[PDB]
Amino acid sequence: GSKPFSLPILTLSELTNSRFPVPIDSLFTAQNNQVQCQNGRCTLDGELQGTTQLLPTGICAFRGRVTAQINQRDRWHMQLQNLNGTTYDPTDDVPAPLGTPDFKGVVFGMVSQRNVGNDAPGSTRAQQAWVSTYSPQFVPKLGSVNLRISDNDDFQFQPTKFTPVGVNDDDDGHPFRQWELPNYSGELTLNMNLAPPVAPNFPGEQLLFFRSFVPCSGGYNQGIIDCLIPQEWIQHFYQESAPSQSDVALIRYVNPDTGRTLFEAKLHRSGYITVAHSGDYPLVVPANGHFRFDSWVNQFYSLAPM
Amino acid sequence: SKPFSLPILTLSELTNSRFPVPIDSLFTAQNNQVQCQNGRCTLDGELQGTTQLLPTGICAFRGRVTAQINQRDRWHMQLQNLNGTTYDPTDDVPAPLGTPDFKGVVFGMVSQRNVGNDAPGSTRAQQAWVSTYSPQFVPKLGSVNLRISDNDDFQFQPTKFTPVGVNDDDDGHPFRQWELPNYSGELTLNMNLAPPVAPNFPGEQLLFFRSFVPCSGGYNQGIIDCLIPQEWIQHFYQESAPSQSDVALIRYVNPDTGRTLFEAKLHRSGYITVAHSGDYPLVVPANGHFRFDSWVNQFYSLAPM
Ligand SMILES: CC(=O)N[C@H]1[C@@H](O[C@H]2[C@@H](O)[C@@H](CO)O[C@H](O)[C@@H]2O[C@@H]2O[C@@H](C)[C@@H](O)[C@@H](O)[C@@H]2O)O[C@H](CO)[C@H](O)[C@@H]1O
Ligand SMILES: CC(=O)N[C@H]1[C@@H](O[C@H]2[C@@H](O)[C@@H](CO)O[C@H](O)[C@@H]2O[C@@H]2O[C@@H](C)[C@@H](O)[C@@H](O)[C@@H]2O)O[C@H](CO)[C@H](O)[C@@H]1O
Ligand SMILES: [Mg+2]
Ligand SMILES: [Mg+2]
Fold this sequence. Notes:
The structure is a homodimer. Chain A contains 1 helix and 14 strands; from the N terminus they run βββββββββαβββββ. By secondary structure, chain A is mainly beta. In chain A, strands 1, 8, 9, 10, 11, 12, 13 and 14 form an 8-stranded antiparallel β-sheet that branches. A 6-stranded antiparallel beta barrel of chain A has the order 2-3-6-5-4-7. In chain A, strand 11 and strand 12 form a beta hairpin. The longest helix of chain A has 10 residues. Chain A is elongated. The two termini of chain A are about 35 Å apart. The relative contact order of chain A is 0.24. At the A-B interface, strand 4, strand 5, strand 7 and helix 1 of A face strand 4, strand 5, strand 7 and helix 1 of B. The complex binds a molecule of 3 linked components (GLA-FUC-A2G) (2 copies) and magnesium ion (2 copies). The site of a molecule of 3 linked components (GLA-FUC-A2G) has 4 residues of chain B, from strand 5.
C-alpha cells in the first residue's frame, strides 16, 4: 500500500533552476559525451543529495563572518556558517555547505554586513562582490571562501551574507565550465560525499535539461546553466516522500487545453530525465505545457522517439 | 473534498513572500493598516495582489531600458512580465506581479544582455537602486526608473533587476514596509488591491513571518513581515483544497517531543492571528512548525499564547 508518486503542476515559466536562483527558460537535450552537478540533486522518494537544500534563495549563496584579509586578489576571508546561521561542521557527510556553487567560474553578486557585538552593533553596509570557485582559497568544505569586493575600505570583520546575481568566466583563461566541479577542499584534495554522476544507460537516449540563461557581468558568455530537475520538483518530492516502485518513472509532457501528450520521457529514481533523441536540441513546446507522471516502468522500457 | 494541509517546513526552510530571503523568526504585533500585495493567497489557492509563484521573482523587474532623463531616477525601464511576456496595463492587477509593495529603496544589481544589431550577446552588470517613492515609479503603467552606479556603461537593451536588500533613501524618505507605493504615480489611486487584513476577535493579534533583510548603510533593521510564507502559497496553489470554514485552526508543534507549543487561527483569506496582547518576538525551537488541526469558525476562542 504505497503513497502515489506525483509531480507538481507547473509550467516552465513557473519553475526555478535548482543550480542557480533564476527561472527556467527552456528545455534542452544534449549529445552524450560526465554530468555530476551537486545542487539540484534529489531522489524521486525525496532524499536530497550533494549540496542540495530547499530554498531557491540559498542556491549559490553564502553566510558567515569575515575574519581576516590576505594580500591576494581573493582578499577577504569568509568563515562559513550553514545558510540557516547554525555552526558549520566540516565533518558532516556533505561535499560542502549546502547551497555551495557546483561549477568552475566566478559568481558575482553583492555582499552585505550587519554588525553584532560591541563594535557599532546594527550598523550595515553592502557592495558588489565576486567569488571565484577556481581560487585556492575556495575551500567551502573546510569552512571558508575568499571574496573579491569593490571597496576594500568599507568592509569589516562582521557577519556577512553573499547574494548571487550571475556568473562569468574568470580572467587569465579560467572559463565558466558548468559541468566541472570545484575542489571543495582546495588543491590536491578529493571531493567526497558526492551525488553520483548521471548518464543514459539505454541506446538512443540523451539527458534532458531544464535550461536557464543567467546574468553575466561582461563579455559574451551565454550564461547557460542546465539542471536535472527544477527546484520545485525537489521541494515537492521532499514533501511527498512517495516510495519509488521501480528504477524508472514514465512521464509525459502534456498540453492541458488540448489534452494531448506531446512526448514522453524517463524520470529516473536518482532524479534525472532522459529522452529518445540524437543530437543537441532545444525543445520548442507550448507555454502551458508540463510533465505529468504516467506510470512506473523499468530499464528495458523503450521510449517513443522525441 | 480534498483535505487541507500545510507543507512541513521549519522556519529556516521557509522563504519570505515579500522579499527573496529566508524567514528568521515569528512575531506578533500590537493592533494599531496591513495591506501588503505580495504574499497574498487564499487557503484554497487563489493568488491575490501582485503575488506570483517564484521566490526569485519577488521584488524583481524584467524589461528593456529605453531612455534616460536628467533626474536622479535616470534610466527608464519599460517592463515586461517576469516570464518575458508582454505586460498588459489593462489587466486586473495592482501592478506587474512581483512588484515591491512597500515604500523605500530596493538595492540590488541590474544586468543586461544585448539583442539585435548592437553587439548581440554582449553583457554587463552593476549596482542599481529602485526608489518606490519616485514619481517615475509607475509599474502599473508599465515602467520604473533606475539609479545606477556607472552611467557610462549602460545601454538601451534587455535588462533584469535582481534585488538584494532595502533601505531608507539618503534624502530622508523612510523605509515603510506597510505603506503601499503609488503604482501609477502621483495623483493616481491604486486599484485591484488585495484587501487590508486585521484581527476581528477580541484579544487577537496578527502573527507574522519575519525576516531581517540586508541594508546598504545606516542602522535600519531591515524588517519585512509577511502574512504567510512563499512555500505555503505554492502549496495552496497546488492543492486547491476547499475551505470548509472561514478559519483553519493550526498548531505549532515540536516534532521531536511531539508537543504543541501554541495554537493559532489561519483565516481563509490567508493570514494568521494568535491570542496575545503586545508586540512580541516569539522564541521557539528550531524544528518547530505549524500543522493543520481542524476547521473552526470566526468566534473560536484560542488558548492564550
Ligand atoms: C574597469 C573598466 O573600466 N571596465 C570597462 C570596460 O570593460 C570591458 C573590459 O574589461 C574588456 C577587456 O578588454 O572586457 C569587456 O569588454 C568589458 O566590458 C564588458 O563587456 C563588453 C562586451 C560590453 O558589454 C561592456 O558594456 C561590458 O562592461 O569597458 C566597458 C565598455 O566596453 C566598460 O566601460 C567597463 O566599465
Ligand atoms: C559616499 C560616501 O562617502 N560613503 C562612505 C560613508 O558613508 C556613511 C555616510 O553616508 C553616512 C551619512 O550620514 O551614513 C552612513 O554612516 C554611511 O556609512 C554606512 O553606514 C555606517 C553606519 C557604516 O555601517 C558604514 O560602513 C556604511 O558605509 O562612510 C563609510 C564609512 O563609515 C564609507 O566610507 C562609505 O564609503
Ligand atoms: Mg503528476
Ligand atoms: Mg498539515
